[PDB]
Amino acid sequence: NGLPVCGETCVGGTCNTPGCTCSWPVCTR
């Protein structure tokens, strides 16, 4: 939801993980 602690990235625009908030370069929660 903003916190850059998703642990996943989204260089393609798809965190690939749920309950995430792709913010680039890394998604957030």
UniProtKB/Swiss-Prot annotation:
<protein>
    <recommendedName>
        <fullName>Kalata-B1</fullName>
    </recommendedName>
</protein>
<comment type="similarity">
    <text>Belongs to the cyclotide family. Moebius subfamily.</text>
</comment>
<comment type="function">
    <text>Probably participates in a plant defense mechanism. Has antibiotic activity. Has a diuretic effect. Has a uterotonic effect in humans. Active against the Gram-positive S.aureus with a minimum inhibition concentration of approximately 0.2 microM. Relatively ineffective against Gram-negative bacteria such as E.coli and P.aeruginosa. Inhibitory effect on the growth and development of larvae from H.punctigera. The unmodified form has hemolytic activity, the oxidized form lacks hemolytic activity. If the protein is linearized, hemolytic activity is lost.</text>
</comment>
<feature type="disulfide bond">
    <location>
        <begin position="15"/>
        <end position="27"/>
    </location>
</feature>
<feature type="disulfide bond">
    <location>
        <begin position="6"/>
        <end position="20"/>
    </location>
</feature>
<feature type="disulfide bond">
    <location>
        <begin position="10"/>
        <end position="22"/>
    </location>
</feature>
